[PDB]
Amino acid sequence: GTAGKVIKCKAAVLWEQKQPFSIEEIEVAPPKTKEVRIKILATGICRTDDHVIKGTMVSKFPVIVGHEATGIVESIGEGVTTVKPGDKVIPLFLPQCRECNACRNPDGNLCIRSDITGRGVLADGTTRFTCKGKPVHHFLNTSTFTEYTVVDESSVAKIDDAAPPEKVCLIGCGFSTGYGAAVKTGKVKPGSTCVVFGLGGVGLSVIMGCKSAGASRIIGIDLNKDKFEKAMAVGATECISPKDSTKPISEVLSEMTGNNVGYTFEVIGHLETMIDALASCHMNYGTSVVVGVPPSAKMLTYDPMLLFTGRTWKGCVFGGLKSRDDVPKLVTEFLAKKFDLDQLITHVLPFKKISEGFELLNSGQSIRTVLTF
Amino acid sequence: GTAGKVIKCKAAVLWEQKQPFSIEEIEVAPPKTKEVRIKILATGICRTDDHVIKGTMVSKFPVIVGHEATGIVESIGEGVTTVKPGDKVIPLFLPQCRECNACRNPDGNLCIRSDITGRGVLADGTTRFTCKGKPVHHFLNTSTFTEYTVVDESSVAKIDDAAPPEKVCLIGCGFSTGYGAAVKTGKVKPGSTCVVFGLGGVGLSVIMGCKSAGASRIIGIDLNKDKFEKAMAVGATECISPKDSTKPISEVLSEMTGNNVGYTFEVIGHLETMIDALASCHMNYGTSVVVGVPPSAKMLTYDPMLLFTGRTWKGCVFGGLKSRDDVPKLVTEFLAKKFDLDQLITHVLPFKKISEGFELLNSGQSIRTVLTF
Amino acid sequence: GTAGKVIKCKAAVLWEQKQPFSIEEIEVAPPKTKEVRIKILATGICRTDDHVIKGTMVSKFPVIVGHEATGIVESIGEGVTTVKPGDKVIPLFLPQCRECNACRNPDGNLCIRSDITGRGVLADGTTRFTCKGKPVHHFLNTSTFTEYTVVDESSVAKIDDAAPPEKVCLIGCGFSTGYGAAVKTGKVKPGSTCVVFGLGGVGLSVIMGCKSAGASRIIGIDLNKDKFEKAMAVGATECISPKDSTKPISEVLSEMTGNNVGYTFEVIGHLETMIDALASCHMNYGTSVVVGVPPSAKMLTYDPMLLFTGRTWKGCVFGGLKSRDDVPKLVTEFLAKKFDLDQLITHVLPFKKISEGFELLNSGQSIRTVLTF
Amino acid sequence: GTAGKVIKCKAAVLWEQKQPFSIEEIEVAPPKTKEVRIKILATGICRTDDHVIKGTMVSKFPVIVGHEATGIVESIGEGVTTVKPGDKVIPLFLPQCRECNACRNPDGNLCIRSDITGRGVLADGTTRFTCKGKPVHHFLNTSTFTEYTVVDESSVAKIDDAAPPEKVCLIGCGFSTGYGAAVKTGKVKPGSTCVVFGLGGVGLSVIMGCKSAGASRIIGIDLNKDKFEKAMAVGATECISPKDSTKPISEVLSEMTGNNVGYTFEVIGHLETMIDALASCHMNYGTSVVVGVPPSAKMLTYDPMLLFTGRTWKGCVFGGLKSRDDVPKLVTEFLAKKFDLDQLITHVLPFKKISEGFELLNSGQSIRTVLTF
Ligand SMILES: NC(=O)c1ccc[n+]([C@@H]2O[C@H](COP(=O)([O-])OP(=O)(O)OC[C@H]3O[C@@H](n4cnc5c(N)ncnc54)[C@H](O)[C@@H]3O)[C@@H](O)[C@H]2O)c1
Ligand SMILES: NC(=O)c1ccc[n+]([C@@H]2O[C@H](COP(=O)([O-])OP(=O)(O)OC[C@H]3O[C@@H](n4cnc5c(N)ncnc54)[C@H](O)[C@@H]3O)[C@@H](O)[C@H]2O)c1
Ligand SMILES: NC(=O)c1ccc[n+]([C@@H]2O[C@H](COP(=O)([O-])OP(=O)(O)OC[C@H]3O[C@@H](n4cnc5c(N)ncnc54)[C@H](O)[C@@H]3O)[C@@H](O)[C@H]2O)c1
Ligand SMILES: NC(=O)c1ccc[n+]([C@@H]2O[C@H](COP(=O)([O-])OP(=O)(O)OC[C@H]3O[C@@H](n4cnc5c(N)ncnc54)[C@H](O)[C@@H]3O)[C@@H](O)[C@H]2O)c1
Ligand SMILES: C[As](C)(=O)[O-]
Ligand SMILES: C[As](C)(=O)[O-]
Ligand SMILES: C[As](C)(=O)[O-]
Ligand SMILES: C[As](C)(=O)[O-]
Ligand SMILES: C[As](C)(=O)[O-]
Ligand SMILES: [Zn+2]
Ligand SMILES: [Zn+2]
Ligand SMILES: [Zn+2]
Ligand SMILES: [Zn+2]
Ligand SMILES: [Zn+2]
Ligand SMILES: [Zn+2]
Ligand SMILES: [Zn+2]
Ligand SMILES: [Zn+2]
Ligand SMILES: [Zn+2]
Ligand SMILES: [Zn+2]
Ligand SMILES: [Zn+2]
Ligand SMILES: [Zn+2]
Ligand SMILES: [Zn+2]
Ligand SMILES: [Zn+2]
Ligand SMILES: [Zn+2]
Ligand SMILES: [Zn+2]
Ligand SMILES: [Zn+2]
Ligand SMILES: [Zn+2]
Ligand SMILES: [Zn+2]
């Protein structure tokens, strides 16, 4: 059996910054106390993983990226009580220890164990991956571009057995982030007028969230007009582009709504568009939510008056969800046909084609690409 | 009688920026349509007024400042229905026309008639003051450093007749802003921890707000340790100065609280402290309210990452109050003994002694100085 | 695009009388010769619309009511020449073909195309709505509680582009009616004494008309004493309720004015108040204008002596205004700030909250609720 | 002389209703303060006088009716200043005290002193006639079927000495009623189309009034076709009878005029025809003037929708004339040859033949019958 043993399996390893993937043969250490070794069934390609490759996301090397996936528990560590071998699960980059301040607080979800600094190691401070002697790091409490991974129990979400791995894997990041961004972070209201910068997989998910929140007008923004057809079909009552006019996108949006934009979402990852989305919500009651991760070590410079007048500016992590709580529920909600993830998955390919996946994403020819094992 | 006629009286004029007050004899034209001419009984000296003098706040010159006051209606203009002569009123710098989007919005308050650009005129675009054959500008729909002033009806609140004008005048800016900032803009929850950057008149008011909201810890921060005694008398659990330690204030606060700073309030007017306040609240579930008025034409550069983690950053105008509905309620609550304003008034001087009032404000030797007529 | 195509949208339908609204998916056929398809931006809730529900206003079922609205022309049918796609417009329940007698007569305004018999169809006799494969009838040449509607060109007024939809929609009925009822129909002369029975949306507008005309005393009447505050503000000099005294309201009015009630307006819709309003004007030189709609199939029995003595009794449709001529002019006058429409609008809600709009009217809590799309 | 002495003379008296006159010897008391005793030269027989006999008009018994006449002032009471003995006058059944609201109001004419209640007394509340000991009552402030009568100075119009008393007496009721009904109450416009219900003495005068107003069409209506030739002679353009067709008269008239009946006058006295007259004027811009006196204590039931659509419905007392100002002018205009009264007088008989006059009226063999002394 594999339990207790070291599992030799393949994994898409990254040896250094700005280098292509390399599918090595690696060895996954068995789960120590309160850890869980998971066999990955399908993992999607989130734009964040690409950040590490680009170097806009802090990370130690070598590292096995990937964090959006579904899998089965191959073996539980000592002291594990939330899952047993055979259970279907979803690895949580955003954990839920249920013990820290942010966890004990209904309005907080950024668990203390959240890898926000590029630690690239588990709770005890070590790695569980080896490749050619040298140890390979973790990515955001997960690492899913591997046949097997080992995560802390606090980052394991037991989900329903009948859940399609290649679909619900979007609940591990992309979908839950955009949806929760509207529903739980900005808390969009019925009849509201929202704006969505960036029509990628998370962008399209925010639109879905707003629409499910009763927003009557949802304007989608993107440079890539090819994304519009998807946007309009997701819930966008309209879609425009910064380049369609020479006047500030803020002014345009104002004029379009007669100065009544109650919500704006930045779902790209640019600082320039963070100022844009802020400037675009109403100067006194408008709320601007930042979903896109800003590039590492970049300082923002804007006009504070835009905030003084009353605007609310907040950031978002995993759509404001409390991972271990909300994730299994969101899976149940999918099974009950409540939301369609299929609209998001533009490509389903075998793990080996990972390089193609990062070619597609980077060309705008795809929303979500699910790598299957 | 004086109704219908031009009134000749004394007003503290500011002929140009970076110049002292000049108490001239000016002419106050009678109230046109839906305008109200008020006899000023008591007016407080607010830091925002000093900004006009210092030159860090936009204004046309000459101009009559003052915007925190209690008065009596001398005469109403044609069409006025909410007040009649002899009525006790508080002129409002933040109007409430009850008809615009912000006014109609239950989460708004920055009425479209607000003089947010330093126009220095009333709704019809004209001034009611003249001195030496020259038209003197109005200040934020009010101008109270004058025996009489004329405001629009949307900028007048009828208050209880029994209200001590030399106390409830703070309800026209200082107290309402601070107290509102905590109870309304911030929505401080009971049992939480708050940090107030700035212990002047507004700062101390925010403490009263947090205290009214049930917060278990309210930490005051000021470089002037002479402010601490007062801060403690009005509810602060403890006070400290940034100069007390070399490590970042945000680190000190986090440590002092076990990483649990629920809310912070910038009640000073420095971009640097705005960022310190932002950073000092819990990265994921913390809220930071910008009460202080940023100096004219200065951009703010801060680390975006501070936001992304989930922090909520929001502006604050007049405590988030809908002026015409809330000011009378605060007066009613003052008369209901729900809070004391005496703790905020450290000096009560004749109007002619305004320059001494400004000296004490600047020298840190006074919270609120109230000028009487 | 949508031109020449069947639009699919949502509309609040009434399947039978004495039933709640049921927002359904409906199809709206493209405009035929001389018709115009309009996208609705905002629409008011008029008491007449509620009559259909109550069964006291004739209509064929199912039907889409709503008539007080502002919109933008989605497209124009063959032969149209007064509006073009993009034009902002107010749909007119009161046509103005300009050919018929009432149209050619400077004192007339009820065009032959006016729907006074519950025809619920367009000029060619057919419908443009379908729901579940079945025709749905129009209402008063308009039908605005739908995202899209088609009207005959005779029933559209091209208004100024800067006109705020959620405000100028009141010019499609409520305001123009009660305003003109005083200025145009009753031709209230300066110095007179007017009396308004009913202080709702239309009743308040009547008062503005009387005030505008020059009446010296405008007396408002309403069983709902909560409506007094606004009547007073709008122009009333005093208000009273039928209940305040046991003596017939006419006696009360005679005694208050010393038998000098020049004009009376019935802005309710009860036969009893129609008579009450009649008996209330001076028996020999008094004029009584009926603005309220009398319930269908109800005969009015009165004392002919009230009339014989010299009293003038006259009906009033849309305040006696000629639709396509006067609507564009009232919009322009609004933009010139001649009359205040926002005083009438107490609630702005999103279209989906229609039931709430009616319940508010029916509970006596609103004047006008504007539903926005 | 007779001045100051009780005058014994004859008069036609009704001892009770539904009883023919009885020429008796009566005593006419001298004129008290501000009264005038008049010698009746000529008096006309108006249908209203017959209402008293039939019982459909309210009056006390016994009584001396008649109210249409010309006479000469025998003696004036104390304080009289408008007329002197020998002066030719016309007694006014409709007074003009010049001090009540109606009298002072330019649009009023029903003076406060009018006997609208059936009192049959003078201003001071007493009678002046006596017969067989018992006092007989006055009628409509006049009483003219007597050789002598006493009216109040307010009910006395001094006319031109050169006026044919047997012709100008029509200016005491009939002519003035119908003529003014068109020109003053109805304000008939040039080129309009009028319809006159009732081709009797008052109707023919309305027709003369419509003809002077410049009407284009004047359609007369009567059950008695023998009345047509005269109607055509005074100005009618055509005449018809309700029985000429089975379809409602309103439809007939509409078809005849192409739905353009601007004015309708009811000069008969039936509630049914008052309604028929209403429904016969254009539903929106039509005006219906009620001239015929409705039978006492009879309620009128109609369809309020006839009024609602815009019809103006109004009463008429003495064709809208302010008796003391207008009667003298009508006489002067008569002597200016403006109109011809001869056409209205079909018979001139001596006072003793009163019964014949009433026989001819009730049989349709006479228009106006004048009784001479
Ligand atoms: N906060 C989190 O919890 C969280 C979770 C998931 C993803 N993310 C972050 O969200 C962002 C996007 O997520 P994604 O997976 O949907 O990426 P994505 O690439 O699919 O979306 C990028 C979209 O933005 C559009 N875009 C790029 N530049 C633009 C510009 N200048 N103006 C308008 N549109 C522009 C692109 O055309 C594309 O449609 C990334 O920063 C990712 O790291 C954050
Ligand atoms: N939002 C608004 O509606 C509104 C309303 C009223 C006042 N204000 C603004 O609020 C701010 C305060 O008003 P105030 O009347 O209470 O002024 P104040 O002069 O009484 O208070 C300033 C306080 O901050 C302290 N301070 C100054 N620099 C500091 C620093 N670097 N670190 C810590 N403490 C420092 C001062 O010692 C003083 O105690 C000003 O910006 C004023 O313009 C805004
Ligand atoms: N003539 C038309 O062209 C035209 C146009 C618009 C509306 N209307 C009709 O006008 C009438 C009122 O319109 P609205 O929109 O202003 O409705 P509304 O409901 O807002 O106003 C009705 C008002 O009358 C008051 N009222 C009701 N019963 C009363 C009574 N028994 N005695 C005294 N006051 C009483 C109500 O409390 C309310 O204040 C309705 O009949 C409507 O159908 C007619
Ligand atoms: N308003 C006043 O100031 C005033 C003044 C004078 C007369 N009146 C009233 O005017 C009315 C007419 O007076 P008149 O003196 O001319 O009397 P009248 O008898 O001469 O005229 C009555 C006419 O109506 C016709 N008529 C009756 N029933 C008919 C019907 N159903 N349809 C059509 N025609 C019919 C008769 O044939 C006759 O031609 C009476 O009611 C009288 O009391 C009122
Ligand atoms: C079937 As049915 C009552 O709508 O005619
Ligand atoms: C007129 As039906 C659709 O109710 O039968
Ligand atoms: C035609 As039916 C009375 O069923 O609505
Ligand atoms: C004759 As017509 C068209 O005005 O009814
Ligand atoms: C006598 As004629 C006016 O009908 O021609
Ligand atoms: Zn991701
Ligand atoms: Zn935790
Ligand atoms: Zn980009
Ligand atoms: Zn201030
Ligand atoms: Zn406002
Ligand atoms: Zn100036
Ligand atoms: Zn400072
Ligand atoms: Zn001191
Ligand atoms: Zn039916
Ligand atoms: Zn209406
Ligand atoms: Zn039908
Ligand atoms: Zn027409
Ligand atoms: Zn009612
Ligand atoms: Zn207004
Ligand atoms: Zn008569
Ligand atoms: Zn009089
Ligand atoms: Zn008697
Ligand atoms: Zn008859
Ligand atoms: Zn005979």
Short mmCIF file of N, CA, C and O in Angstrom, two decimals, chain A residues 350-371:
data_model
loop_
_atom_site.label_atom_id
_atom_site.label_comp_id
_atom_site.label_asym_id
_atom_site.label_seq_id
_atom_site.Cartn_x
_atom_site.Cartn_y
_atom_site.Cartn_z
N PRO A 350 -5.15 16.89 -20.68
CA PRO A 350 -4.43 15.97 -19.78
C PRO A 350 -3.26 16.75 -19.15
O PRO A 350 -2.68 17.64 -19.78
N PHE A 351 -2.94 16.43 -17.89
CA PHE A 351 -1.87 17.11 -17.17
C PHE A 351 -0.63 17.48 -18.01
O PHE A 351 -0.16 18.62 -17.96
N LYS A 352 -0.14 16.53 -18.80
CA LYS A 352 1.04 16.75 -19.64
C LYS A 352 0.96 18.01 -20.51
O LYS A 352 1.97 18.65 -20.79
N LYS A 353 -0.25 18.35 -20.95
CA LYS A 353 -0.44 19.52 -21.80
C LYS A 353 -0.39 20.85 -21.03
O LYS A 353 -0.68 21.92 -21.60
N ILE A 354 0.02 20.79 -19.76
CA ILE A 354 0.13 21.98 -18.91
C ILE A 354 0.79 23.16 -19.63
O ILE A 354 0.29 24.29 -19.56
N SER A 355 1.87 22.90 -20.36
CA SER A 355 2.56 23.96 -21.09
C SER A 355 1.62 24.63 -22.11
O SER A 355 1.67 25.85 -22.31
N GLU A 356 0.75 23.83 -22.74
CA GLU A 356 -0.21 24.37 -23.70
C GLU A 356 -1.17 25.27 -22.93
O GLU A 356 -1.50 26.37 -23.37
N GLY A 357 -1.59 24.79 -21.77
CA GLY A 357 -2.50 25.54 -20.92
C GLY A 357 -2.02 26.95 -20.63
O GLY A 357 -2.78 27.91 -20.78
N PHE A 358 -0.76 27.08 -20.26
CA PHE A 358 -0.16 28.39 -19.96
C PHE A 358 0.15 29.20 -21.22
O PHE A 358 0.64 30.33 -21.15
N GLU A 359 -0.14 28.60 -22.36
CA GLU A 359 0.05 29.24 -23.65
C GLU A 359 -1.29 29.87 -24.03
O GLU A 359 -1.35 31.00 -24.55
N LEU A 360 -2.36 29.13 -23.73
CA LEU A 360 -3.74 29.53 -23.99
C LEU A 360 -4.16 30.70 -23.11
O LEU A 360 -4.68 31.72 -23.60
N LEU A 361 -3.99 30.51 -21.81
CA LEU A 361 -4.34 31.54 -20.84
C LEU A 361 -3.67 32.84 -21.25
O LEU A 361 -4.34 33.84 -21.47
N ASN A 362 -2.35 32.78 -21.45
CA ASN A 362 -1.60 33.97 -21.84
C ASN A 362 -1.94 34.60 -23.20
O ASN A 362 -1.43 35.68 -23.54
N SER A 363 -2.82 33.96 -23.98
CA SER A 363 -3.22 34.51 -25.28
C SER A 363 -4.68 34.99 -25.25
O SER A 363 -5.18 35.53 -26.24
N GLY A 364 -5.35 34.77 -24.12
CA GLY A 364 -6.73 35.19 -23.97
C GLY A 364 -7.72 34.25 -24.62
O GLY A 364 -8.93 34.50 -24.62
N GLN A 365 -7.22 33.14 -25.14
CA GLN A 365 -8.09 32.18 -25.81
C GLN A 365 -8.76 31.24 -24.83
O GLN A 365 -9.40 30.26 -25.23
N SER A 366 -8.64 31.53 -23.54
CA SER A 366 -9.25 30.67 -22.56
C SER A 366 -9.63 31.39 -21.29
O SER A 366 -9.15 32.49 -21.00
N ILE A 367 -10.59 30.79 -20.60
CA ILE A 367 -11.05 31.29 -19.33
C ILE A 367 -10.41 30.30 -18.36
O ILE A 367 -9.31 30.55 -17.86
N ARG A 368 -11.06 29.17 -18.13
CA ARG A 368 -10.49 28.17 -17.25
C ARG A 368 -10.09 26.93 -18.03
O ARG A 368 -10.78 26.52 -18.96
N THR A 369 -8.92 26.39 -17.68
CA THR A 369 -8.39 25.19 -18.31
C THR A 369 -8.24 24.16 -17.19
O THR A 369 -7.52 24.40 -16.22
N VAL A 370 -8.96 23.06 -17.29
CA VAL A 370 -8.85 22.03 -16.27
C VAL A 370 -7.92 20.93 -16.73
O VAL A 370 -8.14 20.30 -17.77
N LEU A 371 -6.83 20.76 -15.99
CA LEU A 371 -5.87 19.71 -16.26
C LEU A 371 -6.40 18.50 -15.52
O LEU A 371 -6.71 18.58 -14.32
#
